[PDB]
C-alpha cells in the first residue's frame, strides 16, 4: 500500500475517525510537511 | 566520621539537585494521575 | 515513552557518526474540550440490551443550554479528536448490564431497537 | 453498510483471465496462507464508510 495511505491508517489507529481524516487531508499533510522542514534547525548546542 | 573527614582528607559531598519538597510533588502526581479511559486507543484524552 | 513522547505515529532513522539518529513523529494536541461522557447505554425492556463504545466515547453534543433528557441525544466520538457522529453497530459492542449505564426511554440508537420487523 | 476483514484479506480467486466485474466475487483469506473461502460474519467487521 502506498506511503500516503499507510499514514492515514496510523492516524486511524490512535483514535481519529475516517470522517475527520477525509475532511482534513490537506491540513494534515501541511502539518506533516512543516515538521520535516523543522528538523534542519535542531542541530544546535541547545539540542541535547 | 566520614562526614567530618571531608575537611581533613580533601573531598566534598555535594547536595542533591532537588530538595525533599520537589520529590514529594513527584509522588503526589503519581497517585492521582487521570490517565484517560482504559478501553480507548491513544494517549491524548483524559477521563476523570 | 519508548518512541518519544505522546501518541506515536511514525519514526525515521538516518546515519550519524558512530551510529543511528532517530526522528519520532508523534501526535500533540493543542486545545481541548470538556465533554460529558457516559459509561454505556441500556434500553428499558426485558430482556435488557446494553452497549459500550469501541475506541471512543459516548458523548453529548454540547451546543445550547436547553437540551435536557428529551433532546439529550448521545453521539459517538473518537478518543483523539472531538467530532460527534451517530451511534451504529460499527462503533459499539454489546456488553453485560452495568449499574452506571444510562437508562434510555426514547431516542435509542439502532443497536438498541427492536430489529424484528 | 460496509465491512472489513478480521486478521486476513479480501482477495480475488485468480484462476482465469475472463472474470471481470460480473463474476469478480471476493473471498476471504488468512494472512499467513493463501486459501480463499466465503465471506461470512465469522471473518468480517462492520466499519464506517
Ligand atoms: C453537533 O453540534 C454542532 C454545532 O455545535 C453541529 O454543527 C453544525 O452543523 C450544521 C450542518 O452541518 C452547520 O450548518 C453548522 O454551521 C454547524 N455548527 C458549527 C458550530 O459548525 C453538528 O451538526 C452537531 N452534530 C450532530 C451529529 O448533529
Ligand atoms: C437504570 O435502572 C436500573 C434498574 O434496573 C438501576 O439499577 C439499580 O440501581 C440502584 C442504585 O443505582 C441499585 O440499588 C439497584 O439494586 C439497581 N437495580 C438492579 C435491579 O440491579 C440503575 O441504577 C439505573 N441507572 C441509572 C443511571 O439511573
Ligand atoms: C478458487 O479457485 C480454485 C482453482 O484455482 C478452486 O479450486 C478447485 O476446486 C475444485 C472443487 O473443489 C477442484 O475440482 C479443482 O481441482 C480445484 N482447482 C485446483 C487448481 O486445485 C477453488 O474451489 C476456488 N475457491 C472457491 C472458494 O471457489
Amino acid at each position: 500500500i502506498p506511503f500516503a495511505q499507510s499514514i492515514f491508517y496510523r492516524l486511524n489507529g490512535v483514535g481519529i475517525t475516517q470522517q475527520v481524516l477525509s475532511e482534513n487531508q490537506k491540513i494534515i499533510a501541511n502539518k506533516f510537511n512543516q515538521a520535516l522542514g523543522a528538523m534542519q534547525t535542531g542541530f544546535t548546542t541547545t539540542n541535547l | 566520621d566520614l562526614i567530618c573527614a571531608q575537611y581533613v582528607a580533601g573531598y566534598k559531598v555535594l547536595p542533591p539537585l532537588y530538595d525533599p519538597y520537589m520529590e514529594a510533588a513527584y509522588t503526589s502526581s503519581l497517585l492521582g494521575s487521570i490517565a484517560g479511559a482504559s478501553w480507548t486507543a491513544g494517549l491524548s484524552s483524559f477521563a476523570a | 515513552g519508548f518512541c518519544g513522547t505522546g501518541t506515536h505515529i511514525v519514526s525515521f532513522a538516518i546515519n550519524a557518526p558512530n551510529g543511528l539518529y532517530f526522528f519520532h513523529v508523534g501526535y500533540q494536541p493543542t486545545s481541548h474540550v470538556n465533554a460529558t461522557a457516559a459509561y454505556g447505554l441500556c434500553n428499558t425492556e426485558n430482556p435488557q440490551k446494553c452497549i459500550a463504545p469501541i475506541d471512543g466515547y459516548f458523548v453529548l453534543n454540547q451546543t445550547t443550554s436547553t437540551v435536557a433528557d428529551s433532546d439529550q441525544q448521545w453521539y459517538y466520538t473518537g478518543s483523539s479528536f472531538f467530532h460527534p457522529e451517530p451511534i451504529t453497530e460499527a462503533n459499539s459492542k454489546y456488553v453485560s448490564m452495568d449499574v452506571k449505564f444510562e437508562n434510555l426511554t426514547n431516542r435509542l440508537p439502532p443497536p438498541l431497537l427492536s430489529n424484528s420487523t
Side-chain angles (χ1 to χ4, degrees), chain A, chain B, chain C:
Chain A
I1 57 183
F3 180 84
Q5 267 65 52
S6 73
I7 290 296
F8 290 131
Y9 268 106
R10 291 174 182 240
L11 296 168
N12 188 29
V14 309
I16 309 182
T17 67
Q18 262 291 325
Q19 210 202 312
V20 183
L21 292 170
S22 78
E23 283 167 37
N24 298 336
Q25 291 202 324
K26 217 62 63 61
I27 310 178
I28 284 171
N30 289 339
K31 286 164 170 287
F32 196 89
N33 282 344
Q34 57 163 119
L36 301 184
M39 300 184 316
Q40 41 141 346
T41 24
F43 297 145
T44 49
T45 63
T46 78
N47 183 21
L48 85 152
Chain B
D1 219 315
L2 47 86
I3 295 302
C4 294
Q6 312 169 42
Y7 321 109
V8 300
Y11 57 91
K12 230 308 214 67
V13 174
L14 299 182
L17 185 74
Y18 300 117
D19 59 333
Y21 287 89
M22 176 61 55
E23 45 198 23
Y26 177 65
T27 50
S28 304
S29 74
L30 249 43
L31 187 68
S33 58
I34 287 185
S38 65
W39 62 79
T40 59
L43 288 319
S44 49
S45 66
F46 313 107
Chain C
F2 194 63
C3 316
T5 54
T7 325
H8 178 243
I9 306 298
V10 82
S11 281
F12 311 102
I14 62 166
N15 276 307
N18 305 307
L20 288 168
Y21 197 90
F22 289 87
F23 300 95
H24 300 299
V25 178
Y27 177 87
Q28 280 176 357
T30 54
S31 84
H32 277 80
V33 63
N34 294 342
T36 314
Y39 298 101
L41 312 176
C42 298
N43 51 11
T44 46
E45 68 168 15
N46 192 89
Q48 208 169 68
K49 302 159 67 182
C50 298
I51 51 175
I54 299 177
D55 291 333
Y57 303 101
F58 284 164
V59 291
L60 247 29
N61 199 5
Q62 21 87 266
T63 67
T64 76
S65 296
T66 48
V67 272
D69 301 338
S70 186
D71 323 67
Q72 260 194 8
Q73 200 176 24
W74 296 89
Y75 302 101
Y76 171 78
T77 185
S79 64
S80 290
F81 200 86
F82 188 81
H83 180 61
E85 38 206 300
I87 298 174
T88 74
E89 22 83 16
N91 44 29
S92 58
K93 294 144 52 187
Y94 283 107
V95 283
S96 294
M97 185 259 312
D98 202 348
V99 198
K100 321 186 300 292
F101 286 0
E102 310 277 354
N103 293 315
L104 300 181
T105 67
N106 65 323
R107 314 175 93 89
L108 302 177
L112 298 179
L113 285 175
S114 55
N115 191 265
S116 65
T117 60

